[PDB]
Write a protein that binds this ligand. Sequence first.
Ligand SMILES: Nc1ncnc2c1ncn2[C@@H]1O[C@H](COP(=O)(O)OP(=O)(O)OP(=O)(O)O)[C@@H](O)[C@H]1O
Ligand SMILES: [Mg+2]
Length: 1362
Amino acid sequence: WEWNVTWNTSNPDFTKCFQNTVLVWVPCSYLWVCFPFYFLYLSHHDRGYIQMTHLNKAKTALGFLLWIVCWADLFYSFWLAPVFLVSPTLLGITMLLATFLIQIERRRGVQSSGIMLTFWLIALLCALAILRSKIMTAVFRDVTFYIYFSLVLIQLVLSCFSDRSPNPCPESSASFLSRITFWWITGMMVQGYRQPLESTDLWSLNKEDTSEQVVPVLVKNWKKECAKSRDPSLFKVLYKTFGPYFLMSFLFKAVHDLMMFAGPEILKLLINFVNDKKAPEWQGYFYTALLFISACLQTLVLHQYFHICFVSGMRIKTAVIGAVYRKALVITNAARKSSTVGEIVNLMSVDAQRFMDLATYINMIWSAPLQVILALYLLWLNLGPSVLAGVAVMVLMVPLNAVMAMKTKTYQVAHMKSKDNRIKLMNEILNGIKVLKLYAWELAFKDKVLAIRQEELKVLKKSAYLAAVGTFTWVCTPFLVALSTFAVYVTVDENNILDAQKAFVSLALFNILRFPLNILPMVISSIVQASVSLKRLRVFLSHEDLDPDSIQRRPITNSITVKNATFTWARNDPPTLHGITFSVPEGSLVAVVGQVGCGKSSLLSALLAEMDKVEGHVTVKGSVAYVPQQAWIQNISLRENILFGRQLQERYYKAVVEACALLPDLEILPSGDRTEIGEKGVNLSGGQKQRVSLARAVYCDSDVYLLDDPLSAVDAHVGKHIFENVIGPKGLLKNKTRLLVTHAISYLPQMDVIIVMSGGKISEMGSYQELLARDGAFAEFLRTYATWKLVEADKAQTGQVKLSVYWDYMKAIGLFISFLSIFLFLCNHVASLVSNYWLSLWTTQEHTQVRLSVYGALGISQGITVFGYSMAVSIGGIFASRRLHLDLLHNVLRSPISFFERTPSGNLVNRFSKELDTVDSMIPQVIKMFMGSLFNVIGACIIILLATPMAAVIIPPLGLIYFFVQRFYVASSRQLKRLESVSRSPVYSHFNETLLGVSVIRAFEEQERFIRQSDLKVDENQKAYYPSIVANRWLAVRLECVGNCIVLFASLFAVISRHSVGLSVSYSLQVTTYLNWLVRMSSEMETNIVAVERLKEYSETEKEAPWQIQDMAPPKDWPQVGRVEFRDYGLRYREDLDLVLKHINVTIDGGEKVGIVGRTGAGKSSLTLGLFRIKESAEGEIIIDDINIAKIGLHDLRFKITIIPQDPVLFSGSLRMNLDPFSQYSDEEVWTSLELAHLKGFVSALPDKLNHECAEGGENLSVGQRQLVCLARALLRKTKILVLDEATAAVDLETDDLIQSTIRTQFDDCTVLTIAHRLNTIMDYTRVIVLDKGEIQEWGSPSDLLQQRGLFYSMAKDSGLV
Ligand SMILES: Nc1ncnc2c1ncn2[C@@H]1O[C@H](COP(=O)(O)OP(=O)(O)OP(=O)(O)O)[C@@H](O)[C@H]1O
Ligand SMILES: [Mg+2]
């Protein structure tokens, strides 16, 4: 090796020894270092074995022949030079390793080899170099090399084709080149250009990324971790699960850094050749070719690294969602109260996003130091032994930034904890929107949600401040280090030789150092956010687990054999069931009776292993079917609700439908048992829900039935019919154990055992006959008798996002920030341009100091502007997020009830949880980066145009070739993002539906089907998400290669056309980067803008009538008498179907108690909706005290009309907040109301009294005590209209009489419209007006109706009052 023949001569020729040693050691060596490592992948990853094909054999045979040929050389050498022995043998054995490798790759099922193609490629290049040398030299050993080269070339061509496999994703069957270039997606891309993509174009999900193939691994690893540590660390299981696939990203990142650092060196060498005519031209071309191949390989390896990181993040998100769902289905009640529904919704919505953000930057926590250390070491041997001073700066800056970052972790904890409270509050708002709108409590909760949002948005401002200050130090680090090391370098010794050339090199290198330190703030912020989101996930996954071994669920004497067990709702709270002991024989109908909050329902929940056992033995035998007190209904057709995971059996299904009085219900529905039933059963009535919930349990034939009051909402006749045909001894369940919890006693004589439970312990136990002779606590009670698809789905828009969206976001940000931020951007970029100009243009130690001072001033000015615009962008983004949340909340609240009926409660959760996450976090940073890239591009174009008049006809084409591909990419990226969000919404819907009814699912042992449904929905979401990232890589690969094809032309021109412009080579290198970056950023912003678009989607939806009308204002004492009078009133349930009320005309007098009563599906709960303007009246006019209701607003009417809703619902927070959320009543007033509603005897014993912490939706209370709270609210309001929408249904007889007496006493001067199914209360009323089929039938006093022997007489006959 000497420079005369290898570099100095115009003939590019390697030396003979170099040819025979290094050129042969390179390829053989590559396979030797990769071979061992490759077994890891070949072993850990398997796909079967490929069959015997001609291609595989062709490759194997050529591998055998190639080895022979190489050993044939050793034979001829055996037949002086030392290299003529070792080299042929080494090549033969590495060749024997190559053929063995394709063999094992066949065995392990790999169609395209990631090593063979590269191995042959490198071998080919080495052979090409020797080939050219051997053909320039000119039989004996040359012909062996020609045979070797031809065989290697054919082997390389063969290795490109993909072998046979052992609407799927093409990634599995794509060839190596297609996989490395992401070619296989281009079809979708061009498809997205023809017409917008739909969900059907989105391909299927790979088997490796599927939910059922990812979640079980993490779940098993978590069980192992939580079993070894009898507290476990979530980090250990997380990396043990997601490390083997991620280490490839580490390898690719190392290669990308080692190849990127070569780029500037090759550029510098090229710019010295072009600026020199004393070097053989061949050297210049070689430089351009080397730069081109280096840039191409750099982009390929970088984009492989990025794809691996993104895929790992996607898998992490899928695993996190699956594990959260499984734990939520497994969680216990106490932990469920501790870990609110907002916490779970945040865990599978914003937390995984933090993990995928961490996935991109975790690989940089070693790359950035590595680059910094490499640059510092190279400067050590470039400038001298004075760079250590710069080290001191890192020792005086890093700790500060670390201390500052540590404060952010205590600032993100409150940010991610004040988000769960808001999400929980909005979940309770959406679950009980009907009551929250019937009580006019809209702004009472609108001004309450904007009290946890502004607590969550303030810590965001503080964290943004700490992030801007943290990036300030990183942006000023280089210049400060330069100043410190130069101040030391001059004094470190007599080395004051800061010559322009040296100073120039050091300054350019220190500028290069800016790239590793410009990504550190994002890495640190992502690490902090991921640790904050890791703590919460570890806490949630470490909660207490329900124990199904507490109750011996023996399969199949006595079905239930409770043995003095003392159950409790939570570990620390005092027990609720004390010393319960009973034994129910098989088939014996048992009726639990007592009072409100006595433990009747708690007993069934304790027999379901849903309630903690202090001690005792329970042996409920068989399969248990549960009918909850509040019916649980999903969003499917009524037929599937009845089936509930069972195949249809006409013989049984028809009998079940007939028995539970469902034929009358399956005749008024639009299409019988094929109509969409709504998310929460809103399509059904209050009594039909109970019948459907009972039919679901009856169809699922079990051995033990725990009926928690299944006849608490149906009228007397239908209840009798159901009991006789289902629950009685002559029904379908005549040979099944039935714990029929009942409040109103009518079938007690037909009971077998009557459990009288009071206080919490079984106070009495015996049949009807054995309880009439006790003459005690309970005997005196008996003596005294006390198709269209209604729910739609989120639909993506087709086309470009309207600028209106951009305009609304800009208006949300404001004007002052929209100009100050732009000014800071522009000033920063112009300062950078001048710093680059001066360092370059200006390239006398009096000048050296001046140059150093001005450079430091420019760097500090750049840092100041960077910090300033980061602050401005963060503040503007927070302002925009606040405004957007306010607008979205107002739009949701102002929407009518029908909107909530047709929109599933997973779209709203999506807008308020995930889209808001994007608006707060991703959009500001994306806008900042896009603005920076755009301004950089404009500045670079300007500086080229000003300093090069010739380069004026290339700017328009260069802009066009990038604008066209930008459009071609965004046209599909927008639709991919839209489908991602649309497919995501269902997941939230399913999570809410499951979390609502966990108890029923556990009781029916039907967890697997719901787990599979959640897996399917998450699979659809990831099917929508994966093409987005794949298209991201495709766009970048094409752009970074298209721009890289240009620099090649510039380099060649600079070289080939110089004697007959050294700047263009670097200009193309510099500008193309800005152009590509800019394009990417634009697309990114566009995609994120989609989120804002969806937040706007609810604005155009038609809303309710104006809440307050100032022109039409009622007097303060407007309801003087409450003379309700319906004139021609007809209400239509939905616009398509027919009228539900046909020309009713009713004249109610002031203060006259009305007792509206009718059969099921008679439109009883239509006057209640109409009187509150819940649904606009197609025709008719309700007039209260001479003023039409339709003319007044809404809040005026709502506040002044009291209602007791059919479904008792208690919002989260304190018990007081469920009474006066406006805080308009004193403590004494509320306490008087409590004793008025007969609840003071329960709240007093509570340790927190009035401020007791209610659970999510009120499960902390009973169902009768939740109705007593509604009665307390009605007493507190105390208004002259008291429509009772089927109230007092879930309370015992004596409590019913007590609250009836309270209503009769304190509400004897109001126009109360008591809709009820218990006719005994309606008997002592002034008008018992009857509705039958939407038309008026009876009109008069109850006595007149009874004597008329009409419909009401038959109704009186059915109940048992005649
Ligand atoms: N989810 C819960 N968390 C905590 N305590 C609860 C919960 N559910 C019930 N309790 C406690 O158990 C008591 C009894 O409730 P339960 O609903 O069993 O009474 P009940 O008499 O069957 O009610 P109802 O008359 O409405 O049928 C409540 O008053 C409350 O103290
Ligand atoms: Mg109950």
